[PDB]
Design a protein around this ligand. Structure first.
Ligand SMILES: COc1ccc(N2C[C@@H](C(=O)N(C)OC)CC2=O)cc1
Ligand SMILES: [Cl-]
Ligand SMILES: [Cl-]
Ligand SMILES: [Cl-]
Ligand SMILES: [Cl-]
Ligand SMILES: [Cl-]
Ligand SMILES: [Mg+2]
Length: 345
């Protein structure tokens, strides 16, 4: 049974939504977002209306990708989907897609700049990031864009990962936080990357919680690489062999060699167990970084680790990513996922 919809103009946009959603108010603008009160669940929610979801094959496939990913994520430390709807009554009139999640308050940016964090706060915050990442990586999903603005935190220090990587050249240029948390092998297209890029990001975030300062605030790609290599050392021949670009290999060998620094003299006064974990995350060779599952068992988290309460995900079929389809075929696949949605308990 289809709910009754009502229409209203929010700023310059017509919004048509089920009656359950009340008191819509614009808060942000890929799509515009409104806060609302969900009278069925009692929650304050975010409602996102996608902008031109099927205007090109690239756009239509991205719409399908985002919906498939949000429908799969069912974990305490990851954003999940409360609802998805369209006012269309058939595939023939299908044009608009609306996504509904819990409304997030502050992000980790607010916290790190405004609050005095104890070591216990850092333990709990990083533990929750790693617990969510163990789940995400168990489905062979790579987040690719972990940074403080994509981590939501509440008054009780509880955390959720948001805004999966689903970014342009201009967005990554210059003195910008959009690049400061990226692993060097993806920042410079050294090689085919994998899920280890997310652990580099966690290391950069953890360092910033401990010091209150950005770890690698580069003014451009090359300045940032120089900051990275000064801390962790220039690469040895083993890693150089793995850099597929001969151009990038050539540039690396133009730099004078540098040893890895002493992290206890960089992170002055930090818990020695926190220093140890940072040395295992911030490794230049991605093959040798600690994994999320291994990091949860590190002694730094002894207060919180429970191997019977760190779940893995159901399998996630990503075969669509190598599939070539027409706009109307991606649109039909998206329609099927809208109408098959089953809400959480
Ligand atoms: C400041 O302006 C905004 C305020 C909130 C939000 N969002 C987006 C929500 C989400 O992850 N989905 C995909 O959107 C339904 C979660 C959330 O709180 C976005 C902008
Ligand atoms: Cl309703
Ligand atoms: Cl959620
Ligand atoms: Cl529609
Ligand atoms: Cl950020
Ligand atoms: Cl699947
Ligand atoms: Mg974001």
């Amino acid at each position: 049974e289809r709910p009754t919809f009502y229409r209203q103009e929010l700023n310059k946009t017509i919004w048509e939504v089920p009656e359950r959603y009340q008191n819509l108010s614009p808060v942000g603008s890929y799509g515009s977002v409104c806060a609302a009160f969900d009278t069925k669940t009692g929650h304050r929610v975010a409602v996102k209306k996608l902008s031109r979801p099927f205007q090109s094959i690239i756009h239509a496939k991205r719409t399908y990708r985002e919906l498939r990913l949000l429908k799969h994520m069912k974990h305490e430390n990851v954003i999940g989907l409360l609802d998805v709807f369209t006012p269309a009554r058939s595939l023939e009139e299908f044009n608009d897609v609306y996504l509904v999640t819990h409304l997030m308050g502050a992000d980790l940016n607010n916290i790190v700049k405004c609050q005095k964090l104890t070591d216990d706060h850092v333990q709990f915050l990083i533990y929750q990031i790693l617990r969510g990442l163990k789940y995400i990586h168990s489905a062979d999903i790579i987040h690719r864009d972990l940074k403080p603005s994509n981590l939501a935190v509440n008054e009780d220090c509880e955390l959720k990962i948001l805004d999966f990587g689903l970014h342009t050249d201009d967005e990554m240029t210059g003195y910008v936080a959009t690049r400061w948390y990226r692993a060097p092998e993806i920042m410079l297209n050294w090689m085919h990357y994998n899920q280890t890029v997310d652990i580099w990001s966690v290391g950069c975030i953890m360092a910033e919680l401990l010091t209150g300062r950005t770890l690698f605030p580069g003014t451009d790609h090359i300045d940032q690489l120089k900051l990275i290599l000064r801390l962790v050392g220039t690469p040895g021949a083993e890693l150089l062999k793995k850099i597929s670009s001969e151009s990038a290999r050539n540039y690396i060998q133009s730099l004078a060699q540098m040893p890895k620094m002493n992290f206890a003299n960089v992170f002055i006064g930090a818990n020695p167990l926190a220093v140890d974990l940072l040395e295992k995350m911030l490794v230049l060779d991605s093959d040798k970084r600690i994994t999320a599952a291994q990091a949860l068992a590190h002694a730094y988290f002894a207060q919180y680790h429970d191997p019977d309460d760190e779940p893995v995900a159901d399998p996630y079929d990503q075969s669509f990513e190598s599939r070539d389809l027409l706009i109307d075929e991606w649109k039909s696949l998206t329609y099927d996922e809208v109408i098959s949605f089953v809400p959480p308990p």
